[PDB]
mmCIF file of N, CA, C and O in Angstrom:
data_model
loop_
_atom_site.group_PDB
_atom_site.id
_atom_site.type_symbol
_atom_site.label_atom_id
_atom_site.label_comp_id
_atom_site.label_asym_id
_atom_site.label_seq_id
_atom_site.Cartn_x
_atom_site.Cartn_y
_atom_site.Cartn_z
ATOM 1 N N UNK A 1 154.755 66.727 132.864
ATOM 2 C CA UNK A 1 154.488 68.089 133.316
ATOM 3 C C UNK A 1 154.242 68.008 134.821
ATOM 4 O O UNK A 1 154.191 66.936 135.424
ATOM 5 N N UNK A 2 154.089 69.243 135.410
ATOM 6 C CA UNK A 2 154.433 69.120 136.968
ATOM 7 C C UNK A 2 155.436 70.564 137.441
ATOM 8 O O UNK A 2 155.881 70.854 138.552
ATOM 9 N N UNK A 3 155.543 71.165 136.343
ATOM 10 C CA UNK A 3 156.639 72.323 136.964
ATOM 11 C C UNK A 3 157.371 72.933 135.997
ATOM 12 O O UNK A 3 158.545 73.185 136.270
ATOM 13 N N UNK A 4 156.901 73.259 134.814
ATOM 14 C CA UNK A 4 157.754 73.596 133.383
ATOM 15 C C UNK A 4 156.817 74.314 133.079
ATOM 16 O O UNK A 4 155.637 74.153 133.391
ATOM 17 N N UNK A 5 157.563 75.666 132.064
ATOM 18 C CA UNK A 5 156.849 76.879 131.450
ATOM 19 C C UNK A 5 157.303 77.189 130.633
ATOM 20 O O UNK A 5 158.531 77.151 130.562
ATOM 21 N N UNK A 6 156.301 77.787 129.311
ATOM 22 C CA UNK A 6 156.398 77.668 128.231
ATOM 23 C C UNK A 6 156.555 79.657 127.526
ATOM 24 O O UNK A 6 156.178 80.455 128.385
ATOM 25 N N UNK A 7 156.906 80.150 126.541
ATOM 26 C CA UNK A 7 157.208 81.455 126.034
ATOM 27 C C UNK A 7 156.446 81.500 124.867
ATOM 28 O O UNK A 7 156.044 80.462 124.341
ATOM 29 N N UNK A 8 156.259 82.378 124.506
ATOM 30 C CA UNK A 8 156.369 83.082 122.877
ATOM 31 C C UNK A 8 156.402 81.916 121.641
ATOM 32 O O UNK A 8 157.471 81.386 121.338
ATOM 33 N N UNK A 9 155.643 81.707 121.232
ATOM 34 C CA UNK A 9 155.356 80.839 119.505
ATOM 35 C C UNK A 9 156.545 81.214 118.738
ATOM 36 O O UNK A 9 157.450 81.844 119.284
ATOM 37 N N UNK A 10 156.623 80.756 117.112
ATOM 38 C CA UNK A 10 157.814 81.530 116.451
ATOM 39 C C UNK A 10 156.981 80.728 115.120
ATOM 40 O O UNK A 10 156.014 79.967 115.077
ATOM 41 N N UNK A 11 157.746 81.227 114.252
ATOM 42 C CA UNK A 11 157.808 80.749 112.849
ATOM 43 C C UNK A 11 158.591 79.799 112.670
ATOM 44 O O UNK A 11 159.609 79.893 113.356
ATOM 45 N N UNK A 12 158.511 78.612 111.802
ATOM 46 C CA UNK A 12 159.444 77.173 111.280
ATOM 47 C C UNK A 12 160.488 78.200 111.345
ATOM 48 O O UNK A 12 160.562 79.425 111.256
ATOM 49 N N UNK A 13 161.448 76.962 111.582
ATOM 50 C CA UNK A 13 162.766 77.740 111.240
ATOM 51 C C UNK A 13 163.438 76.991 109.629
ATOM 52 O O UNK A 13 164.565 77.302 109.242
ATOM 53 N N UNK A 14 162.689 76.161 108.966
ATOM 54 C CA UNK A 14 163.154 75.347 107.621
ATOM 55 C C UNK A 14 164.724 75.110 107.727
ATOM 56 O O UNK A 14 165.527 76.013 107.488
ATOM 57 N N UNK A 15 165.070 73.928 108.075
ATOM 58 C CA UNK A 15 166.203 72.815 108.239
ATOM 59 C C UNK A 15 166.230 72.132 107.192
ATOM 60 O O UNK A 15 165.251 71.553 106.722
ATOM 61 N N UNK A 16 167.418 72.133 106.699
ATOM 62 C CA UNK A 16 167.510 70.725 105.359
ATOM 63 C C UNK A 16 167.520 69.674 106.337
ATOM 64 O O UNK A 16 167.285 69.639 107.545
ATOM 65 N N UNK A 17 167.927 68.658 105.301
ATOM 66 C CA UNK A 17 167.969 66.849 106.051
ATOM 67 C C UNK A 17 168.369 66.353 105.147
ATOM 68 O O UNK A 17 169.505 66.001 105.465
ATOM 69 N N UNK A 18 168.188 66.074 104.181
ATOM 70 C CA UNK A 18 169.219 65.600 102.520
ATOM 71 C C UNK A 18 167.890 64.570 102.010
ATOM 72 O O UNK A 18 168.423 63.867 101.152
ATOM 73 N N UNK A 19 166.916 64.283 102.082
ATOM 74 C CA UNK A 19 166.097 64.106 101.366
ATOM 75 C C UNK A 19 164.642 64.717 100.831
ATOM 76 O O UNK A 19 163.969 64.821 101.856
ATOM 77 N N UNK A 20 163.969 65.100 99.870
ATOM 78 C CA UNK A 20 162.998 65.784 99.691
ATOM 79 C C UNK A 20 161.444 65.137 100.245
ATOM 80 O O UNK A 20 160.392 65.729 100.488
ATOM 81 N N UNK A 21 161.751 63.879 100.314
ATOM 82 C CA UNK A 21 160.510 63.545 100.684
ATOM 83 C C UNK A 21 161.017 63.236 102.999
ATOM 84 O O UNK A 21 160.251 63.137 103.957
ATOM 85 N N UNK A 22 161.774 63.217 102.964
ATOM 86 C CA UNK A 22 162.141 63.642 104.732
ATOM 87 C C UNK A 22 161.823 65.069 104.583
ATOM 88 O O UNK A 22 160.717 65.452 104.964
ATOM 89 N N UNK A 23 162.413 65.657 104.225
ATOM 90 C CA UNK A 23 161.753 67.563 104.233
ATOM 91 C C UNK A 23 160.423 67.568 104.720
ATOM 92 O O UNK A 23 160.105 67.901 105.862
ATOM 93 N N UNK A 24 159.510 67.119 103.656
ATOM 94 C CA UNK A 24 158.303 67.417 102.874
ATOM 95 C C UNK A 24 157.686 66.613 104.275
ATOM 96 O O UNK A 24 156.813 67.216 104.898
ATOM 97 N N UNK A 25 158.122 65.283 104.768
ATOM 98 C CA UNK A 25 157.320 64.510 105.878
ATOM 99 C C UNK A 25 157.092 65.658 107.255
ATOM 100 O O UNK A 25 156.146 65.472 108.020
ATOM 101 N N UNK A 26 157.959 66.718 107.442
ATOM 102 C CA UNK A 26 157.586 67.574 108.772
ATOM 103 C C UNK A 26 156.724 68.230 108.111
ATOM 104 O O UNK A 26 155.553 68.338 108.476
ATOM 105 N N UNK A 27 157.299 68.854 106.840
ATOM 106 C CA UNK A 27 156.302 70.122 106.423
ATOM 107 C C UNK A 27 154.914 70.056 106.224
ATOM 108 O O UNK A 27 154.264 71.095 106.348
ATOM 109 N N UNK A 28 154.542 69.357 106.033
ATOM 110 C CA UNK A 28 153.403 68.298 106.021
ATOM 111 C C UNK A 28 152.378 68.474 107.274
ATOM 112 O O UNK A 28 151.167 68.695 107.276
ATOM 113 N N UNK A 29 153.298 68.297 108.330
ATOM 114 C CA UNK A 29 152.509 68.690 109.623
ATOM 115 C C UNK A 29 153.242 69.454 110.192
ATOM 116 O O UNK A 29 153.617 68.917 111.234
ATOM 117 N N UNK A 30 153.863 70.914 110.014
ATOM 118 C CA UNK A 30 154.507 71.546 110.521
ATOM 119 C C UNK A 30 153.649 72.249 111.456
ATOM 120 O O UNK A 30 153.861 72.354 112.664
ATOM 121 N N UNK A 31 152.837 72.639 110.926
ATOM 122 C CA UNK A 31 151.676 73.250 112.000
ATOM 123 C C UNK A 31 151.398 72.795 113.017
ATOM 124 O O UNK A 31 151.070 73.710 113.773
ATOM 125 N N UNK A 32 151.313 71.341 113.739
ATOM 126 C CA UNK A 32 150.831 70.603 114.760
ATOM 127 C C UNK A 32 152.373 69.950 114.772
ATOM 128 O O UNK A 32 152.295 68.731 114.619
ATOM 129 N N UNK A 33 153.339 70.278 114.869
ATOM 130 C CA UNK A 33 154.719 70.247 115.624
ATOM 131 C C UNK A 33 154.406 71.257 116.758
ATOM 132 O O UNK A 33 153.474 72.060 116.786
ATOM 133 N N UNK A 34 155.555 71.017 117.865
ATOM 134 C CA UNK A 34 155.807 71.790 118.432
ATOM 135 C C UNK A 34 156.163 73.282 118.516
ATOM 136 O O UNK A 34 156.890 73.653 119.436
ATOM 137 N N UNK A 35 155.722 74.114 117.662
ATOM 138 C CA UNK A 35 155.738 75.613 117.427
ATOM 139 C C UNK A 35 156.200 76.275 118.903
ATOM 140 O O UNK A 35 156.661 77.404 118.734
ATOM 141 N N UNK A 36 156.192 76.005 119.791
ATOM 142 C CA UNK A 36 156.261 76.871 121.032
ATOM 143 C C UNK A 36 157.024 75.577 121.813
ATOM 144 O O UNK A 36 156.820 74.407 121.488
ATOM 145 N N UNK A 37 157.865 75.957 122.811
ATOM 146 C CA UNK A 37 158.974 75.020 123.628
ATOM 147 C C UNK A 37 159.024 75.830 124.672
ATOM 148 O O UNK A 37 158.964 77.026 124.958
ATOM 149 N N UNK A 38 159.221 74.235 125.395
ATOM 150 C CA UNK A 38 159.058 74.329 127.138
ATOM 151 C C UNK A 38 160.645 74.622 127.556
ATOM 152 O O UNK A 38 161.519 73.840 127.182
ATOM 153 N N UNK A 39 160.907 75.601 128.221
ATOM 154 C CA UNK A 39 162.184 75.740 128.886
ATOM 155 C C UNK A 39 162.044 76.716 130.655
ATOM 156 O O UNK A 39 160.987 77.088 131.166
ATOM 157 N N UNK A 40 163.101 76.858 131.085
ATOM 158 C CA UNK A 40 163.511 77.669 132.230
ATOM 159 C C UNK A 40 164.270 78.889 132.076
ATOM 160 O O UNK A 40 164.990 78.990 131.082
ATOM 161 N N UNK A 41 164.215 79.773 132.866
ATOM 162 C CA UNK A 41 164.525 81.185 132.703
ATOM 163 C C UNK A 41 166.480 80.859 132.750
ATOM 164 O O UNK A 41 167.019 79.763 132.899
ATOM 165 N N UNK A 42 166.827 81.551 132.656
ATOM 166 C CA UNK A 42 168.538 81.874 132.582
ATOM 167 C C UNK A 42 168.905 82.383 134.152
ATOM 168 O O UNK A 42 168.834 83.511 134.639
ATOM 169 N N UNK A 43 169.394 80.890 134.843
ATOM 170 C CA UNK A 43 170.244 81.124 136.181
ATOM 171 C C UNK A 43 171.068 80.097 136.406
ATOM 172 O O UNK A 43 172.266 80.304 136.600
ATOM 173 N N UNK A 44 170.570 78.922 136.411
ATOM 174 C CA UNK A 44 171.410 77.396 136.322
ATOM 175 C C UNK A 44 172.475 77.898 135.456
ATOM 176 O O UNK A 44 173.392 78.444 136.070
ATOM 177 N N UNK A 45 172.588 77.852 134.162
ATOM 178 C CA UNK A 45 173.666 77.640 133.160
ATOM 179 C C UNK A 45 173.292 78.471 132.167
ATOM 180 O O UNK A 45 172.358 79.267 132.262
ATOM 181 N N UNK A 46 174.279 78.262 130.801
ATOM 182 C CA UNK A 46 173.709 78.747 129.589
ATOM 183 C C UNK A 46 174.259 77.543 128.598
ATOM 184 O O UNK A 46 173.682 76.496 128.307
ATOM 185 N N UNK A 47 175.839 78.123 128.077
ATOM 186 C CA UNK A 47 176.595 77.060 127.258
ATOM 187 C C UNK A 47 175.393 77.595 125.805
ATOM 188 O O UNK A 47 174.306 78.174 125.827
ATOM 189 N N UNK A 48 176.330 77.009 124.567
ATOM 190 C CA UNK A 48 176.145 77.284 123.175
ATOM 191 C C UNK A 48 174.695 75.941 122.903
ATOM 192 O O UNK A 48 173.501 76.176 122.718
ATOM 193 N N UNK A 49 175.210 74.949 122.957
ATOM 194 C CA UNK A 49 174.266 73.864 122.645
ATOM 195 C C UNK A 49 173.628 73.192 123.737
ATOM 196 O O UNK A 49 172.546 72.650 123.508
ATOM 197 N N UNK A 50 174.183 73.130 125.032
ATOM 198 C CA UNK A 50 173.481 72.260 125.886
ATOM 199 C C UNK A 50 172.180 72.707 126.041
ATOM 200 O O UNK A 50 171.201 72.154 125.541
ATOM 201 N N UNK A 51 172.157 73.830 126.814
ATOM 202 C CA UNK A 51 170.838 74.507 127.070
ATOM 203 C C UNK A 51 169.574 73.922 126.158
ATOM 204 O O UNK A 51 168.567 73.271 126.439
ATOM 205 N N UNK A 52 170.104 74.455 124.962
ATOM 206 C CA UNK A 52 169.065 73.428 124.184
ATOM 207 C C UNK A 52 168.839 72.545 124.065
ATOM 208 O O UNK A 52 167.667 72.268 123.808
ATOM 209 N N UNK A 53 169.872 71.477 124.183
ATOM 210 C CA UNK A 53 169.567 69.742 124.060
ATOM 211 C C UNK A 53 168.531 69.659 125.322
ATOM 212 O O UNK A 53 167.678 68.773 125.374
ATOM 213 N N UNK A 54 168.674 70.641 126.320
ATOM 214 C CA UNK A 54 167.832 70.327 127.484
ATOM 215 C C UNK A 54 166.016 70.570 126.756
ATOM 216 O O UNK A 54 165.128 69.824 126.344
ATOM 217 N N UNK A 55 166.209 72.023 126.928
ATOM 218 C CA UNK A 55 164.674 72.414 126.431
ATOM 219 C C UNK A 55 164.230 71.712 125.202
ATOM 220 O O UNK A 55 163.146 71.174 125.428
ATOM 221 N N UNK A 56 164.590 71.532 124.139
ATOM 222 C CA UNK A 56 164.521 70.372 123.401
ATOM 223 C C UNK A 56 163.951 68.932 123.703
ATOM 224 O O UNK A 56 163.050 68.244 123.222
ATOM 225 N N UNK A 57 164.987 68.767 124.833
ATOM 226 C CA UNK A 57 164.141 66.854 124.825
ATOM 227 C C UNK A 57 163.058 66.984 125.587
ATOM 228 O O UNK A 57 162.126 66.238 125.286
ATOM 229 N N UNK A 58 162.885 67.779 126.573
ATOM 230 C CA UNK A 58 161.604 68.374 126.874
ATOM 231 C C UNK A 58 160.612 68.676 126.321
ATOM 232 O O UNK A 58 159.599 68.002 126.509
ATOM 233 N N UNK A 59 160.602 69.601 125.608
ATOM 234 C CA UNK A 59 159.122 70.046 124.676
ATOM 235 C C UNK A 59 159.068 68.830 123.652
ATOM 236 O O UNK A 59 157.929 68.377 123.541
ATOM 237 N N UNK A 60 159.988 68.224 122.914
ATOM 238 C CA UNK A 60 160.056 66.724 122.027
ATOM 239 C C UNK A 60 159.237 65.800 122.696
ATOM 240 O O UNK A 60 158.176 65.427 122.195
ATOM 241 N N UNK A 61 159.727 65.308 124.029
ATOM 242 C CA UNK A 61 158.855 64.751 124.767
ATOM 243 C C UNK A 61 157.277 64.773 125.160
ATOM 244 O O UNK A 61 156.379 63.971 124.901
ATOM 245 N N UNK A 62 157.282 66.102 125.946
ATOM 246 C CA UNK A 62 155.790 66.161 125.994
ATOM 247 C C UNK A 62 155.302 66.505 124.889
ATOM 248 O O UNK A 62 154.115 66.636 125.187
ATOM 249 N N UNK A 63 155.391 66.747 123.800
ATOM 250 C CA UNK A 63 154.671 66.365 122.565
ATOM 251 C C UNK A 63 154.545 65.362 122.230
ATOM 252 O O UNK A 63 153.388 64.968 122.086
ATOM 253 N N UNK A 64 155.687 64.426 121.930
ATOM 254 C CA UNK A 64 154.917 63.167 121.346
ATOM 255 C C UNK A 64 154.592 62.068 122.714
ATOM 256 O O UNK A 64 153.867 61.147 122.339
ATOM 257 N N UNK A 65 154.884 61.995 123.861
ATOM 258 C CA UNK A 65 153.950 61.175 124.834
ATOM 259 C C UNK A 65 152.527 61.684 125.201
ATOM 260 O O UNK A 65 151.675 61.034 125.807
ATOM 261 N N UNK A 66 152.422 62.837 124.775
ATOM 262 C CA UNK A 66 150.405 63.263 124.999
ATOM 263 C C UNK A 66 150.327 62.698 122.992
ATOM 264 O O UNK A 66 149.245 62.230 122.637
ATOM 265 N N UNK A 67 151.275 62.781 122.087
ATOM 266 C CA UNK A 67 150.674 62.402 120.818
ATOM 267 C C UNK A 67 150.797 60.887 120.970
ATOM 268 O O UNK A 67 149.929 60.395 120.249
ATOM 269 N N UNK A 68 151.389 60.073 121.498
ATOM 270 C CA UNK A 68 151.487 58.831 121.509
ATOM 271 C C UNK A 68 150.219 58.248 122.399
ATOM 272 O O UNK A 68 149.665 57.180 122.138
ATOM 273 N N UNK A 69 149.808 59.217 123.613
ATOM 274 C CA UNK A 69 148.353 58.841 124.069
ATOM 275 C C UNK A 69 147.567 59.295 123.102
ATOM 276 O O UNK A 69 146.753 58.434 122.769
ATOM 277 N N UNK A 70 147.454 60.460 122.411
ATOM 278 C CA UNK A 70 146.474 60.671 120.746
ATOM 279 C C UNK A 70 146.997 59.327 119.621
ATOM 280 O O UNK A 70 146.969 59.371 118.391
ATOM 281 N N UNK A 71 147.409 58.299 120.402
ATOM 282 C CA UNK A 71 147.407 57.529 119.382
ATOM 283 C C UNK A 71 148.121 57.236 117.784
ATOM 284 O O UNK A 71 147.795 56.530 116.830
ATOM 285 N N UNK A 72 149.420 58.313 118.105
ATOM 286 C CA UNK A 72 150.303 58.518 116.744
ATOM 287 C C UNK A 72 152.095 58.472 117.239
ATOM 288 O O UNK A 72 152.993 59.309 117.146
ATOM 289 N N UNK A 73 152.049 57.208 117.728
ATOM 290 C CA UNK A 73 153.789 57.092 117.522
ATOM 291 C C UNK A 73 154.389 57.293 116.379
ATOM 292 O O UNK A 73 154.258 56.704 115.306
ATOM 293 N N UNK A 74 155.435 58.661 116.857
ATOM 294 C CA UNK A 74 156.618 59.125 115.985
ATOM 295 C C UNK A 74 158.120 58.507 116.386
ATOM 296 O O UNK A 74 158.602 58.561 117.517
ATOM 297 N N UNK A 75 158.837 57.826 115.056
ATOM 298 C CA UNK A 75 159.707 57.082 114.937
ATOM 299 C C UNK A 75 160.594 57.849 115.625
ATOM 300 O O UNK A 75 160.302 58.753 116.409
ATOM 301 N N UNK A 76 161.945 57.387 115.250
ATOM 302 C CA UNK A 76 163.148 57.886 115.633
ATOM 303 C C UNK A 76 163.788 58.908 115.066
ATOM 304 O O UNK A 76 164.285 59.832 115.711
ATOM 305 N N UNK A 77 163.833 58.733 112.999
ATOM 306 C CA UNK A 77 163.956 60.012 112.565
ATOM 307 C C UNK A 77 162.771 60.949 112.803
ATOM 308 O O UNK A 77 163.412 61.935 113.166
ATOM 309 N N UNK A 78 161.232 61.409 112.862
ATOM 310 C CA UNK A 78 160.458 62.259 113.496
ATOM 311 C C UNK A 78 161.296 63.052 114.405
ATOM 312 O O UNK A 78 161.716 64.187 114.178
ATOM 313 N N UNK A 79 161.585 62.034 115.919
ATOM 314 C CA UNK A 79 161.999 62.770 116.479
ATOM 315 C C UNK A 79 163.514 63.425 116.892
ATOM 316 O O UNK A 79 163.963 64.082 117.831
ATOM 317 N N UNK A 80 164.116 62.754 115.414
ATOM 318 C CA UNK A 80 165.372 63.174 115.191
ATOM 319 C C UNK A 80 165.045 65.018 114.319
ATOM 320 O O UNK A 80 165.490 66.122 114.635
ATOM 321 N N UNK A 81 164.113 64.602 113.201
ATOM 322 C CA UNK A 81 163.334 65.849 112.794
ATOM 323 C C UNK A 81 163.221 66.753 113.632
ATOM 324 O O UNK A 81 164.001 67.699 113.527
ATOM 325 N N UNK A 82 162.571 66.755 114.346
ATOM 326 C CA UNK A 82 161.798 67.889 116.107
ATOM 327 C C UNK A 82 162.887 68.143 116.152
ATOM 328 O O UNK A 82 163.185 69.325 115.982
ATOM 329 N N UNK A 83 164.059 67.060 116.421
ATOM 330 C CA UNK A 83 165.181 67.178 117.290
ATOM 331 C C UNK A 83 165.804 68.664 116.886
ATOM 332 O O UNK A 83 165.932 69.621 117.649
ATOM 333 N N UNK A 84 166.194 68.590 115.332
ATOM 334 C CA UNK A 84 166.369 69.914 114.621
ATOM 335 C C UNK A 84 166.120 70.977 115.022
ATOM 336 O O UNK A 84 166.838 71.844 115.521
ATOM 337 N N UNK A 85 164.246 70.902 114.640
ATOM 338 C CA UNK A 85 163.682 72.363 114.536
ATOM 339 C C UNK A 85 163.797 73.263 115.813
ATOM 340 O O UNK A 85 164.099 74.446 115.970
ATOM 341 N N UNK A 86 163.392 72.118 116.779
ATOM 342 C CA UNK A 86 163.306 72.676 118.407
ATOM 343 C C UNK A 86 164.548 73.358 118.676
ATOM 344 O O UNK A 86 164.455 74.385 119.349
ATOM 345 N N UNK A 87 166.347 72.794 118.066
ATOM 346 C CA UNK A 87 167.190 73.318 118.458
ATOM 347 C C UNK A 87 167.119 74.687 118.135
ATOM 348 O O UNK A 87 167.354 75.511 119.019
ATOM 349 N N UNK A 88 166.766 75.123 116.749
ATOM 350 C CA UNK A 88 166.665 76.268 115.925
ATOM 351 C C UNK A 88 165.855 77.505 116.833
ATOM 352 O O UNK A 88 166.195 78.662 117.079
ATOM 353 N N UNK A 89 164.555 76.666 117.235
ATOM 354 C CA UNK A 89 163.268 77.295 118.127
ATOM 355 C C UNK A 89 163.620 77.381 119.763
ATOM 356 O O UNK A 89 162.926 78.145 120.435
ATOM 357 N N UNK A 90 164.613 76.665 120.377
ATOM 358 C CA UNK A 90 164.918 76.394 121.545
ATOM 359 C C UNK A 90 166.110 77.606 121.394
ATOM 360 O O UNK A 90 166.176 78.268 122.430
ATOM 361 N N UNK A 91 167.082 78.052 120.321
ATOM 362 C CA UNK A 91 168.039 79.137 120.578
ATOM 363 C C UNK A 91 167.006 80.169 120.429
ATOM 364 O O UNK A 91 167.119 81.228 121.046
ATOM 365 N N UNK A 92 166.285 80.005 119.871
ATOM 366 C CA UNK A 92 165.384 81.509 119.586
ATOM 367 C C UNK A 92 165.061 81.652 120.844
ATOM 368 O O UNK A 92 165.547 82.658 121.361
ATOM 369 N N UNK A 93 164.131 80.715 121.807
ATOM 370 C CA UNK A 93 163.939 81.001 122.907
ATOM 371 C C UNK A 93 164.658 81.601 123.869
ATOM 372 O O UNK A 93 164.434 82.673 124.430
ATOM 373 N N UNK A 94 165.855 80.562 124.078
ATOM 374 C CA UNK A 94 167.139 81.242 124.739
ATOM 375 C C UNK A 94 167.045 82.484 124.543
ATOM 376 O O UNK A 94 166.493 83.175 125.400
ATOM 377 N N UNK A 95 167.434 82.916 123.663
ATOM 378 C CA UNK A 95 168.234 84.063 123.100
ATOM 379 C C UNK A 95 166.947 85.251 123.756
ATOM 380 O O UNK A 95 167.319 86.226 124.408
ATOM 381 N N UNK A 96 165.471 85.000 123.479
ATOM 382 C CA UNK A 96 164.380 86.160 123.433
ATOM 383 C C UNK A 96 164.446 86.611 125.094
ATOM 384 O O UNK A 96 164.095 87.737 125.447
ATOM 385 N N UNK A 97 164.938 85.593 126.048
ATOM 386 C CA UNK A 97 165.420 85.848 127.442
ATOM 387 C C UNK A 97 167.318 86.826 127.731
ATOM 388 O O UNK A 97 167.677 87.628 128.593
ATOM 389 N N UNK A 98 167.887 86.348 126.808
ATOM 390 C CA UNK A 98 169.386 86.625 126.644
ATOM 391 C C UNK A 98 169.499 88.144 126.334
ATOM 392 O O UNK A 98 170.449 88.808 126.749
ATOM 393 N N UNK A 99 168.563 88.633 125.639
ATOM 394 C CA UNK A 99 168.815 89.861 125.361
ATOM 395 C C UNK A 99 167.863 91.065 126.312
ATOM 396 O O UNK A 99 167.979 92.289 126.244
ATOM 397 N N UNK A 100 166.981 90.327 127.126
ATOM 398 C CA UNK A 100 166.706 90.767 128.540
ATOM 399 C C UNK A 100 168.027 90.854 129.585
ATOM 400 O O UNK A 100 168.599 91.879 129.955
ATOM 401 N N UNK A 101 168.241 89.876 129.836
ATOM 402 C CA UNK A 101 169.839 90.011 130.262
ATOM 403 C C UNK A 101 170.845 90.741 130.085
ATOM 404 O O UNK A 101 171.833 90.537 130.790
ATOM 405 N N UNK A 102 170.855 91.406 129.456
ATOM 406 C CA UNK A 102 171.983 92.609 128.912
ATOM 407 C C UNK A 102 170.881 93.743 128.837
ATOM 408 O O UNK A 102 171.378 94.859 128.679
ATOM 409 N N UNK A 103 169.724 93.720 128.901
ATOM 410 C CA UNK A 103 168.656 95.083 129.014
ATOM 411 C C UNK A 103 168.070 95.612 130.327
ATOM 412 O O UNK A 103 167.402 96.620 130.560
ATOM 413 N N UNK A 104 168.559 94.546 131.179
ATOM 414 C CA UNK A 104 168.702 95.387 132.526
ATOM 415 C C UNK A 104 169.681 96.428 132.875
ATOM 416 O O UNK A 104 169.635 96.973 133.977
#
């Protein structure tokens, strides 16, 4: 952190993954996931998926390096997990700016 800003909370967005007990491992702590994501307003770019891979590895990040100083390293699927939800939560974001954009 140093220069990043954050929007509006949301509801899970519930992602399969093809196993019930991988499901059940986010849902578990869905609450203390990242519910809210760090991004930038709409001027650089947009694009369908990038945008998000951006705001994504961002808010992924500073969540689990302040949780990894709380002392709880999350593996690779975890943050393949996040990787998901954030995309789901990262278009929502997008988008809650996108339709400002056409409301001017």
């Amino acid at each position: 952190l140093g220069g990043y800003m954050l929007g509006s909370a949301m509801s899970r967005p519930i992602i399969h993954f093809g196993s019930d007990y991988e499901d059940r491992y986010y849902r578990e702590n869905m609450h203390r996931y990242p519910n809210q994501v760090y991004y930038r307003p709409m001027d650089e770019y947009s694009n369908q998926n990038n945008f998000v891979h951006d705001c994504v590895n961002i808010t992924i990040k500073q969540h689990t390096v302040t949780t990894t100083t709380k002392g709880e390293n999350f593996t690779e699927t975890d943050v393949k997990m996040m990787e998901r939800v954030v995309e789901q939560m990262c278009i929502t974001q997008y988008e809650r700016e996108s339709q400002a954009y056409y409301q001017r």
